Amino acid sequence: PKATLTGKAIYDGEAVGVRSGSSEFALFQDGGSIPVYIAQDGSYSVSLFNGDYKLVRMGNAPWERPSNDTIYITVRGNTVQDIPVTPYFFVRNVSFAKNGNKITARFTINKVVANANMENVGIYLGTGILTDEKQKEAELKLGNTVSLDQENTAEIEIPSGLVNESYLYARVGVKSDKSSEYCYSQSIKVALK
Incomplete structure (x- = not known):
């Protein structure tokens, strides 16, 4: 029971x-x-x-x-x-697209906790559905001055060990000074072929 x-x-x-x-x-x-x-x-x-x-x-x-x-x-x-x-910071309206040897990431970031301070924003590419700051095939660290409550575009280069794969998983993470963890977007499959 x-x-x-x-x-x-x-x-x-x-x-x-x-x-x-x-x-x-x-x-x-x-x-x-x-x-x-x-x-x-x-x-x-x-x-x-x-x-x-x-x-x-x-x-x-x-x-x-x-x-x-x-x-x-x-x-x-x-x-x-x-x-x-x-969340301290929240990631929404996230989309990815292959453009040449790069993945074009579009995303919006909100500062939900006024007290919190932004440490980094990252774009991650992985072989599997689990992609994050620890499990990744490629990362892009954008710094901590990304504009808020508006769409931003960033392009991460497809690594050598992913370029001949049928697809990959892409994800956006934002880390604050109030947690040891990033807050992420959904892990989204991106067709390469």
């Missing part, structure tokens, strides 16, 4: 992209803690016994993690509940 709790880390109704194996939620009983491992597309799934639970934001996730703020989840059979998060 061990139910399934699924959902997404949500900001402005969108799943918040994160690095695979980096971000979590902790699940408690009011009456230890249960970890809730978040996938790179911001989604999560955890099998639990029926009953009421209290969820908290913690770890190294690239969003605000208040100790005091809890989310009460009542699980009676398979339950689905999205968890609202507030």
Whole structure:
């Protein structure tokens, strides 16, 4: 009778992209803690016994993690509940295109936490669906003065070990001074052939 709790880390109704194996939620009983491992597309799934639970934001996730703020989840059979998060910086309206030996990246960046300061913006190219600042075939570090709340264009060169592949995965990441993790766009497949 061990139910399934699924959902997404949500900001402005969108799943918040994160690095695979980096971000979590902790699940408690009011009456230890249960970890809730978040996938790179911001989604999560955890099998639990029926009953009421209290969820908290913690770890190294690239969003605000208040100790005091809890989310009460009542699980009676398979339950689905999205968890609202507030990223320091958010990446939206991301698109990629092959133009010669380069990948043209178009993206928008928002400063959601006024307190936070931008450290870097990166464009990543990978062989697999999991692409991030740690797993990458190529990266482009743009600095920390990228204009906000508007589209920007950047071109990353396709590396030697990816140029004869059928496709690749591309992604945009922004890192703040308030988290050890980048906040990312969705990992998007880009046709090369």
